[PDB]
Amino acid sequence: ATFEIVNRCSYTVWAAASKGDAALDAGGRQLNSGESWTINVEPGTNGGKIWARTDCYFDDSGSGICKTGDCGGLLRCKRFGRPPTTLAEFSLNQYGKDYIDISNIKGFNVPMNFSPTTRGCRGVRCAADIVGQCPAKLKAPGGGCNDACTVFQTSEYCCTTGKCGPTEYSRFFKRLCPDAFSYVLDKPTTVTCPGSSNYRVTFCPTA
Template identity: 60%
Template sequence: MARIWARTNCAFDKSGRGWCQTGDCGGLLQCQGYGSPPNTLAEYALNQFGNKDFFDISLVDGFNVPMEFSPTSNGCTRGIKCAQDIKTQCPNELKAPGGCHNSCTVYKTDKYCCNSGRCGPTNLSKFFKDRCRDAYSYPKDDPTSSFTCPGGTNYKVVFCP
C-alpha cells in the first residue's frame, strides 16, 4: 500500500529542512515516512489479489485539500473525488490550522480509531462521509470506499480539482 498527499504552507531552507502546516514529513523536504495529519490521502496497491489494483481516497487522517483519484487507461473509468471544501465546514472540535482533523487524531479512543476491530461510523465520521461519499471516513469503511481496476491501469491524482 502506498500513499500520496498534499503538503500545504511549507517553508524549507537550502538543506531541505523546514516545516509544512499540513502533511509535514518530520521537517524534511524529502519525505521518509507518512505526513502528519491532517491530510487527504490517495492510497493504492497495485497488482494485488486477482491481478487487480485497489485505490481509495482516505479522510482517516483528516482533510487538508480536495482531491481526485482517477484511472486513465485500461478501460477502467470509475474515478473518485472529494471536492468539498471541508475546512470551512469543519466541526469546531476537529478544526486544525490548514485543515480538519479526523476524530481519531483528536480523541484517540477505540470508538473513533477502531483499534479493537469493533467500531462503526460515528457522528464525526459521518460529517466526512456526507461531504465525500466515496472517501474512507473511518477505518472499517471498506464497502463504500475501496475501488478496483485491472492491474496495469494508469492513474492521475489531482489536488484541488
C-alpha cells in the same frame, strides 16, 4: 506505474508520495498552481499513499516544516504525513489488480481527485469544502480538518479493538465525501482497476 500529480489549486502545495517505510520516486516536490509532477511507482507497491502539504518552508538542504502533512520535516518524504491529510491510497498488482481509494481516516486538508489515466475503471473524488464546513472540535489551527481519532484518541474513533461504528464525526466526512473512507471500518469505497494501470492525482479538481 505512472502517477501524474497535478496541482489545480490556486495556492502552492508540496506533493508527497510514500509507502510508510520508504519514499515513492523522489518522495516529495513543490507544486506551484498548475504544475504537474510525474512520478514512477514500482509495480507491486503495497500501501502507497499520495497527499498534499500546505504552507511549507524548506531550507536549501530539504529540511523544514509544513502546516499540514509534514513528514518529519523533509521535502522528500520517506514516511507518512502528519494529519490532517487527504490521502490517495493505492496498492498495485495485488493478484492481477490494482486497488485505489481516497481516505479521510487521517483527516482532510486539500480537495483531491484520484483517477486512472488508462482503461478499465472509474475514479474517486473528495472535492467538497470539508475545511470550511469542518466541525469546531475537529478544526486544525494550522489549517485542514482533523479526524476524530487524531483529536480524541479513543478506541471508538481509532477502531483499535476492531469493533467500531460510524460516529458523528465520521458521518460528517461521509456526508460531504461519500466516496472516501470516513473511518477505518467504513463500507469500502475502494475501486478495482486493471493491474499496472496509470493514474492522475489532481489537487483541487474543481478549481
